[PDB]
């Protein structure tokens, strides 16, 4: 038996500590204290195991959380805790960094994406008209712009573009002529980042 | 000079009177009279010629309208002139027909119809979301229904079916999957008669 020294690990979430048991254990009874009482569980403080990687995750951690955290291991033969304090330092930079990563997920949770809607493809008869609509996310709502031939499209009573409630793109051509035939674009684009879907129409003339 | 004897025809405005001369009409005069007497025109009553077809248009006919018509076709001091008896059994079956004929053109005008929006064709890679929006019309509007490789589609939380306003159909796939591939077809319908627009929907796998 060993088991790593403890260690504070700030996630977007919150704060964890973790050890690393050494060389495989197969049932390791696992018991925490905080401040030399046993902790009550929830969905806000839960732990684990991952492998040998024994762990407590405290999410969004208060004042309240900081303190001495012992990890009591037993594996049937021989006993071992490992302790750490949550204070001062420890917990400042830790508490600064969760913060940090927290906001970085927010940033990613956020960023402007295209959730679906455009075929890769659509043929078409020419003089028949077409309606595609994209779903788009952003918060803040995104800006979306469209390309053909990957340069900027103008709106145009022909073919139509529109986006509403900062979460709908439509592309409406009324009659696809030969000339509406190409590689277009939708761009979706706020302050976390940038997403694009690409679309090609193909038109086939009729008898 | 030489003219076909005159019909009758019911049209889905009334019942027109009309003969061809086998011959040619230059500077030619046409008179018609109704029981002897000239005829009154008005928007309810017309006469025309349109190449050799000299025809009288009787629109919303009544048992008013019946009687002996002459059609006068008058080459200087000379005349060669038609008859016709628009009454009993000739009358009624003009009647019975005209107003059968004026019930098909109410269908026609009214009945649903797709406007458009569906392409013939789409290729998208499986996994991705597909949107595809159909312009309905009908007075009244219409009911929509779907099919899939000829047989009725039921919409789920996955093949999602939509009908708004009586007059947009929206059909959206959450993750095209091989198995959504297919001939999908929109069936519209109201009082007056139908139509269907067909899209296959192919799909391509990913790496």
Redesign the interface.
Same mark, same amino acid.
């Given at each position: 038996l060993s088991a790593t020294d403890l260690k504070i690990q700030s996630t977007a979430e919150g704060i964890q500590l973790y050890s690393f048991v050494t060389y495989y254990v197969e049932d390791l009874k696992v018991n925490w204290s905080h401040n030399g009482s046993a902790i009550r569980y929830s969905d806000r403080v839960k732990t684990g195991v991952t492998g040998e990687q024994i762990w407590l995750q405290i999410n969004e951690p208060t004042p309240n959380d900081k303190g001495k955290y012992v990890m009591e291991l037993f594996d049937g033969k021989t006993g071992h805790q490992k302790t750490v304090d949550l204070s001062g330092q420890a917990y400042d930079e830790a508490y600064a960094e969760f913060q940090r990563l927290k906001q970085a997920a927010i940033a990613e949770k956020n960023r402007a994406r295209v /959730? +679906? +809607? /455009?075929?890769?493809?659509? =043929?078409?008869?020419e003089g028949?008209? /077409?309606? /595609? =609509?994209? !779903?788009v996310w952003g918060d803040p709502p995104p800006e979306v712009s469209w390309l053909k031939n990957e340069k900027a499209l103008a709106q145009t009573d022909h073919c139509n573009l529109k986006f509403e409630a900062g979460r709908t793109a439509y592309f409406t051509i !009324? +009659?696809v002529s030969t000339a509406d035939s190409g590689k277009y674009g939708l761009v979706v684009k706020n302050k976390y980042g940038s997403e694009t879907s690409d679309f090609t129409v193909s038109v086939?003339i009729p008898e």
């Amino acid at each position: 038996l060993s088991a790593t020294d403890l260690k504070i690990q700030s996630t977007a979430e919150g704060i964890q500590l973790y050890s690393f048991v050494t060389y495989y254990v197969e049932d390791l009874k696992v018991n925490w204290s905080h401040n030399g009482s046993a902790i009550r569980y929830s969905d806000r403080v839960k732990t684990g195991v991952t492998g040998e990687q024994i762990w407590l995750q405290i999410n969004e951690p208060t004042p309240n959380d900081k303190g001495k955290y012992v990890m009591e291991l037993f594996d049937g033969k021989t006993g071992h805790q490992k302790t750490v304090d949550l204070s001062g330092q420890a917990y400042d930079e830790a508490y600064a960094e969760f913060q940090r990563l927290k906001q970085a997920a927010i940033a990613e949770k956020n960023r402007a994406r295209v /959730l +679906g +809607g /455009l075929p890769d493809v659509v =043929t078409i008869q020419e003089g028949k008209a /077409l309606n /595609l =609509t994209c !779903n788009v996310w952003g918060d803040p709502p995104p800006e979306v712009s469209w390309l053909k031939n990957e340069k900027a499209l103008a709106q145009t009573d022909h073919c139509n573009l529109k986006f509403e409630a900062g979460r709908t793109a439509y592309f409406t051509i !009324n +009659g696809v002529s030969t000339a509406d035939s190409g590689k277009y674009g939708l761009v979706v684009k706020n302050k976390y980042g940038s997403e694009t879907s690409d679309f090609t129409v193909s038109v086939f003339i009729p008898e």
